[PDB]
């Protein structure tokens, strides 16, 4: 699952991002 | 803590191509492109200025974690997530496959076998239906 979190910090990063 | 430090970190990773220490304008718009986005440069610098405390162009870790950690409203956690879905659901059918996992962790840059995909969907797979669910990639993504 820490391939999971990661990734998804990731994809939320670009969504925080694209405010 | 340490630990959601290294997370961010990690994550800051899959960013910083070159592993120079920061993301540049370049680097955003590598990863929104794997991800299915194509930002214009305009767009991208307006996205890396949102975040560059230090006015140096480029995101660093600190500026990173910075907007990583900041508190982000419940209602809109909620919404975050949702987009978060909709990157990996990318045939929109409301269920992230196998193989749409395998396409998201391969664009990202990540590398794994296609066992560590199916294992990936198989320990957030709790319903058992081959598939992971909204519920289920909130009850993983929290
Ligand atoms: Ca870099
Ligand atoms: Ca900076
Ligand atoms: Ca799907
Ligand atoms: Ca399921």
């Known amino acids: ?19 | 803590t340490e630990e959601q430090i290294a997370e961010f970190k990690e994550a800051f990773s899959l960013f910083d191509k070159d592993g120079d220490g920061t993301i540049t304008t370049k680097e955003l718009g590598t990863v929104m492109r794997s991800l299915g986005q194509n930002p214009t440069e305009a767009e991208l610098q307006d996205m890396i200025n949102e975040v560059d405390a230090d006015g140096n162009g480029t995101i660093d870790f600190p500026e990173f974690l910075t907007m990583m950690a900041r508190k982000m409203k419940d209602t809109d956690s909620e919404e975050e997530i949702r987009e978060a879905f909709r990157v990996f659901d990318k045939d929109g059918n409301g269920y992230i496959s196998a193989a749409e996992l395998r396409h998201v962790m391969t664009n990202l840059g990540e590398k794994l076998t296609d066992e560590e995909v199916d294992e990936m969907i198989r320990e957030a797979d709790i319903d058992g239906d081959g598939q992971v669910n909204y519920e289920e990639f909130v009850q993983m993504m929290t």
Do not use: F, N, P
Request: no cysteine; aromatic share 6%; proline share 0%.
């Open chain 1, 1 to 19: 699952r820490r391939k999971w979190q990661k990734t998804g910090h990731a994809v939320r990063a670009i969504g925080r991002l694209s405010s």
